[PDB]
Design a protein around this ligand. Structure first.
Ligand code: SF4
Ligand SMILES: [Cl-]
Ligand SMILES: [Cl-]
Length: 303
């Protein structure tokens, strides 16, 4: 009854106070269901650019809320838990970027969107899981600096044939460290299922999958693949999203994988956020201006 109370009050306050709710794919299902749009980080930031509303309640982690703010600088962006963050992103530092630029000055700095806003001010181009191959393909250089995810960087090297210098050392997402034995098991249990895993997964997992793709790419695979069962190698929130879009398919987690930071957002603190209209995401004007440069370069490459 309190969830119904909270859901009803959340819906009431968002209309009353003029908020659009954007939720990342990895939010708990109860928050996905009250959001106006559910998607990946860049998808939500670009969706916000289209909106006539000027107030956004963002449900994800801090670098994503900040990406919304960078591309929507004149909108008020609030989050329910100001400590929700990406530990992988936080392991890459300005000092490491500057060190590697000095070592490899002819190598463009390609930063995965899962990166701090401060790191973005130092990057030559931003990329996402879905466009990293195309972005690195179109760059002039046969060598790039790439971070913060080593698995994604090595996947890009495989697909482009280019040299990819990854930073920091052992940059990785703990959520996507499935083991390849999980794929061996599902091949036995569901011999006709299609296995889709994220490019942030380790190479033995990527190489055993039917598809490697971002969450956005996962959402599009059943549009062209009629298989009845998909096994999904990413954070558990995506199962809810996929089942909602394709109710006549079955979606099976490769393993249970939970991002603790994504789960910091709850109905209760989401309600608190609408009641208090906090916590506002604020970036210095200078950070927004500098971080926009590699984001626009990414838009330009994607043509
Ligand atoms: S799922 Fe991994 S990459 Fe995404 S926010 Fe959580 S820790 Fe960071
Ligand atoms: Cl704006
Ligand atoms: Cl993520």
């Amino acid at each position: 009854h309190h969830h119904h109370h909270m859901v009803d009050e959340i819906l009431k306050l968002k209309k009353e106070k003029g908020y659009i709710i954007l939720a990342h794919n990895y939010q708990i299902p109860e928050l996905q269901d009250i959001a106006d749009f559910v998607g990946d980080s860049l998808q939500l930031a670009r969706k916000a650019m289209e909106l006539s509303e000027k107030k956004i309640l963002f449900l994800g982690v801090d670098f994503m809320a900040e990406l919304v703010k960078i591309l929507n600088p004149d909108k008020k962006v609030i989050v329910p838990d100001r400590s929700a963050t990406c530990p992988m992103a936080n392991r890459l530092t300005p000092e490491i970027i500057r060190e590697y630029r000095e070592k490899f000055p002819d190598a463009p700095v390609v930063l995965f969107v899962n990166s701090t806003s401060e790191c973005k001010t130092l990057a030559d181009v931003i990329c996402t899981s879905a466009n990293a191959v195309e972005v690195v393909k179109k760059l002039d250089s046969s060598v790039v600096i790439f971070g913060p995810d080593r698995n994604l960087g090595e996947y890009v090297a495989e697909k482009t044939g280019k040299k990819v210098i990854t930073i920091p050392e052992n940059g990785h997402c703990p959520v996507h460290q499935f083991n390849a034995e999980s794929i061996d098991a599902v091949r036995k249990k569901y011999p006709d299922a299609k296995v889709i895993v994220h490019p942030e997964c380790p190479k033995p997992v990527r190489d055993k999958a039917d598809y490697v793709g971002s969450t956005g790419q996962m959402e599009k695979i059943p549009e062209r693949d009629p298989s009845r069962i998909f096994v999904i190698g990413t954070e558990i929130g995506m199962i809810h999203k996929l089942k909602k879009k394709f109710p006549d398919r079955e979606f099976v987690p490769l393993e249970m994988a939970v991002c603790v930071n994504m789960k910091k957002n709850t109905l209760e603190n989401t309600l608190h956020a609408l009641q208090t209209e906090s916590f506002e995401v604020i970036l210095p004007k200078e950070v927004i201006e500098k971080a926009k440069k590699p984001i626009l370069r990414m838009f330009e490459l994607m043509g």
